[PDB]
Subunit: 491 residues, 3 copies
């Protein structure tokens, strides 16, 4: 009238955070953690502390050959990736084609050292015209002009003597060398420009064995020209020489490029500002600080990135199902201001709440380990995802699409089910911890107290604050009170 009491119960709070499990939707929970990265900085950034190469309105081709309308950032000796606009304004001012263009973009995606040099001075042309090779297709300061890295040689007096030029690569580094051939409209143009009606370009290294022959066709005007310019490149290994021989139609090197190459990346299509940030993952829509194992921003990423996933939310339960003084069978305790599982007692020293420190620590460590495993076990490797295939490589681009789509389907499904399965395991862990605590107490107390059916025991003997602590400590001395208990019990 009335006896001393101890109750088992769990934490509750005012949280509205919701989570899904394999079996229940929209379960309200004490605390939750999102493992899906959804936030980008809306900028292009250095990658592992190396600037990109941003081509505002130029193609790689335009930029390499010196399309004179390409007003770009000139000096820039290394880069981690390249940014082009989808359809750049300035490409090949004089219409034509670039041989093995996509393989060269890929080779240039990421460069350790890049230094333009002069291999063949424009002034070294004594027996040909080095300053007439100019077109209204390639305008400079209003006047007709041409690509600035490469010379369109014309006949002098009425003569085009055979050209022979060797360049020996006396640098420490590989050289990227560029040249071209002119395909004219007809035999009149051919001889008006080069005198000789039948011409060739021959090029040789230790590797290269090339003979080019001009092609006449009747072609549509592009930039008001029916002619075409076709461009070619090689890498001249550090102790080799390249030997040019031509009769006509030769678009000669002036400037070449020293390059040092240490692994690849790709070409990103984006309209964004550079932003002086560093990052380990870049996206066409912005960079990411990538602690999380999953993201949903954009597929075409470069760096060490979370796995890309078709998903709005991946939320893990970390806390509990959120819902005298009755115990656990009736719901949670707002009064349990601290701890996850514990007690409410009432004796003659008064009443209150006490956390089970041991079982609460066990559980917080467990849930923290669960979240850290799901994050830390993720293998995260460098990759560069772009669209590097032209419109006669559609079968290979389709091969690339099945693979990308395949990994998206696998990661999306596996992340969704992983969250649903582990959410259900977590909520069931909390049920199992509460029920184990009740049994911890039931087994210590035996007949020295009575189960009230609501999560509480009423004692058959005076249990002061020290007896209470022994119960919470698992050190309750049953023999020391069996006598007193038995007397009140028999009655």
């Amino acid at each position: 009238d009335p006896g001393d009491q101890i109750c088992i119960g769990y934490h509750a709070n005012n949280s509205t955070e919701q989570v899904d499990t394999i079996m229940e939707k929209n379960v309200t929970v004490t605390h939750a953690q999102d493992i899906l990265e959804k936030k980008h900085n809306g900028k292009l950034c250095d990658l592992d502390g190396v600037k990109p190469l941003i081509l505002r309105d130029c193609s790689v081709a335009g930029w390499l050959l010196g399309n004179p309308m390409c007003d770009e950032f000139i000096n820039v000796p290394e880069w981690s990736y390249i940014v082009e606009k989808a359809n750049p304004v300035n490409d090949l001012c004089y219409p034509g084609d670039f041989n093995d263009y996509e393989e060269l973009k890929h080779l240039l995606s990421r460069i350790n050292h890049f230094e333009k040099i002069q291999i063949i001075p424009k002034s070294s042309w004594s027996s040909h015209e080095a300053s007439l090779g100019v077109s209204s297709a390639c305008p400079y300061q209003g006047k007709s002009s041409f690509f600035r890295n490469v010379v369109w040689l014309i006949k002098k007096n009425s003569t085009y003597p055979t050209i022979k030029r060797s360049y020996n690569n006396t640098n420490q580094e590989d050289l990227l060398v560029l040249w071209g051939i002119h395909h004219p409209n007809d035999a009149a143009e051919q001889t008006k420009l080069y005198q000789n009606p039948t011409t060739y370009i021959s090029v040789g290294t230790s590797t290269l064995n090339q003979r080019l022959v001009p092609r006449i066709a009747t072609r549509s005007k592009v930039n008001g020209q029916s002619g075409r310019m076709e461009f070619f490149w090689t890498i001249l290994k550090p102790n080799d020489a390249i030997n040019f021989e031509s009769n006509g139609n030769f678009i000669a090197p002036e400037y070449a490029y020293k390059i040092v190459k240490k692994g690849d990346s790709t070409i990103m299509k984006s309209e964004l500002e550079y932003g002086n940030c560093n990052t380990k993952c870049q996206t066409p829509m912005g960079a990411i600080n990538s602690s999380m194992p999953f993201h949903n921003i954009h597929p075409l990423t470069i760096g060490e990135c979370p796995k890309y996933v078709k998903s709005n939310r991946l939320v893990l339960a970390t806390g509990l199902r959120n819902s005298a003084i009755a115990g656990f069978i009736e719901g949670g305790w707002q009064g349990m201001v601290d701890g996850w599982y514990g007690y409410h007692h009432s004796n003659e020293q008064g009443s209150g709440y006490a956390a089970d420190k041991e079982s609460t620590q066990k559980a917080i460590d467990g849930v923290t380990n669960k979240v850290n495993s799901i994050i830390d076990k993720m293998n995260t490797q460098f990759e560069a995802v772009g669209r590097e295939f032209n419109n006669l490589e559609r079968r290979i681009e389709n091969l690339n699409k099945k693979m990308e789509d395949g990994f998206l389907d696998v990661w999306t499904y596996n992340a969704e089910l992983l969250v649903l399965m582990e959410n259900e395991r977590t909520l069931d862990f909390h049920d199992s911890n509460v029920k184990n605590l009740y049994d911890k107490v039931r087994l210590q107390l035996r007949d020295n107290a009575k189960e009230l059916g609501n999560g509480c025991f009423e004692f058959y003997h005076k249990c002061d604050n020290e007896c209470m602590e022994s119960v919470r400590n698992g050190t309750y001395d049953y023999p020391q009170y069996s006598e007193e208990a038995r007397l009140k019990r028999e009655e």
Copy 2:
């Protein structure tokens, strides 16, 4: 003598449906659901409401050029995919080669609009022979003939003047244009056919810059010809012109094809009848209504398909382990005609079975949610799987095989373990629900009744049908009977 009784127990039935778990094989279960699609309709069907293109005995090449032995369905202005036989009877009647053939099949796999038109009338050949270009390799109505979409021009009198033809594309749509070159056997044939011993074909668009030259070799007879015909194509963008120039050996366009292209598919190898069905997934062996997330019919599918898996059965447990009146510790109740978990009682108003409505609904919703998650979380995207690589692309076909084989191994393993893990979780859920119901009752009754050890409680007081309902309702009033209970108990 004898006291009133309440028992906890679970549903049983006459089911022989078997399931596997991570720990036990061949467990008999109340109800189960297969998540592996195994049934096809044995037909080729429209795809998302668009007919295929079925080529009964023709190759794409034969069909485009008009091999005169190709007796196909003529009128057909759009299609979703193409069906060829493995080795079609009718290919190139006059032996030769088709330039970039596989890339063109891929481009034609799926077409929004397809309308043949005349660009160069057969009658517009005033100074050459338009009706002699005919071969016993290409038989029509018993008489010697040729491809019907393309003209084999021959010399007239003893003369082959230079041809110049422009066609300006004055249509709204892209044009697919086709032409060829004849490689003859020797210099006699060359001049017997074209008069001029040294010939070329030149072709120009805004894109194209082609010069073809015939090649003599000594070649084996094929369809009784040692000559070869080599074929070429381009897409003429809507405001461009194509310009032909030839000296000899020219196989001229007559008919070209207006095309509109909105995304790709592939070419399916199959021997099946069309069947007037629609579908969202087609297979070389039949279509599929694809609610399920997995199938085992065939890898080479087109559409939004289940994931392909090497597996005979993926069966999920949805029901229970299948096995006075004793309770749960002795097995299931055939008499529990309705509900999953519940009660059997006997008092002076009589005996019978009653379902625990609340815990049964909880569990049915849970299991239904589990099955719906495993199905609905599957990301399902359009894909087209074929064999599009020729016998000098074996390295790329091997790349495609590692990828396909890789996704099969991942999905097969993950589906098998997913079913085994969740089956074990489901059966353990049922054990946990039954044991919780027993404890729900044990905790309400306390000492007003005695545990019989078999899943039953014998009451120490008269419990009429209304007292019984309060127990099942969780509203049992212990104080209202503790008096009566205590008297029968002490004795």
Copy 3:
């Protein structure tokens, strides 16, 4: 004083074997099994009972053409894969190129039958020089020499008549035929060697339609030659003929190769000894007997292999958490020398340990089934992983890298979490089995004994060894002792 007693408890031993779970690191456990293969035999071995082709210091090209410095194992009529060193010493002694080289290596990776034969005797050259075609680039026994499978024809007197040779393939098998063209340095060399200044090679089959033309360029010396030799191949189907015609610059077949092809493999880069072993999985670092579903040795494998994974350990718990006489609530029993779960009893016939045979068998079968599922459900297919793409195929090699890296990330993550999740399920199964055994006993004994709170019951009646067995058997007769129990109880 004192009463008979029965206790529930579990196996313990001196094991230090550690395991991780999703929630706890470094848990000590009774027994564990590694599912990660980490051991190789450091040798190259037959594959499914077929020898490899080991090229000690030769390239495939060198080996096919007969580079005279290639001192290899000569006779070898079938192989399962090819081994090259990274950069072989002996390649093309006379510098040049091999047309479609990588596709030919791939075709030759695995061969059912390989027999060299003579198609064109060196002696059958009556009107040309068959023994002058020799170079100081291609040294034999100190003297100048050449490739031994192929003849470098030179002019005789001062004449190079047109060559015409047919070879009809009168064998049962496909023929691999090899030829070349010589690109000389200048027009002097051209006529010094072949007399005729303007030359060609023409080659025809039912398939092939080739015309080769030599190319002059000014080229760097390689092996002290500025000339280049370019090589070509076809497969001559069993009833076809190949027809050669040349004017000059012809490197003629002498020997060709009968081949039978039944599926592909690849080319392995390795420095290892052959070792007379068989195997179903080979690695650049050694073979594997591949019972396990995962390995961490090397990615570039050939055969039916475990999945490659970035991981040091994948260890599964198979045993238990490892830790009067008190029962389970206080820890495990070293004395439980046999069985997993069971009993300790003490009556007047004496004390000791007894295994619960039924529940121990249930659990051992369960854990054995778990381990066997995780291993046996793995789909294991033939695959051949190499680096088959040249330095103008970098985009495709990058496509191959994303795919390989993608499957490594998926398998590594999924294996790690699979072990952590199932470890946690296994340890929780053991807790659940022990607690169920205690309740099995509590429910049989009811008030005929008292819970001591430590995992033990003290009986209220004499329980001899036969009464004890009925408890362990689940056949304990409560009525047969309720009388005796009640007397000692009331007191």
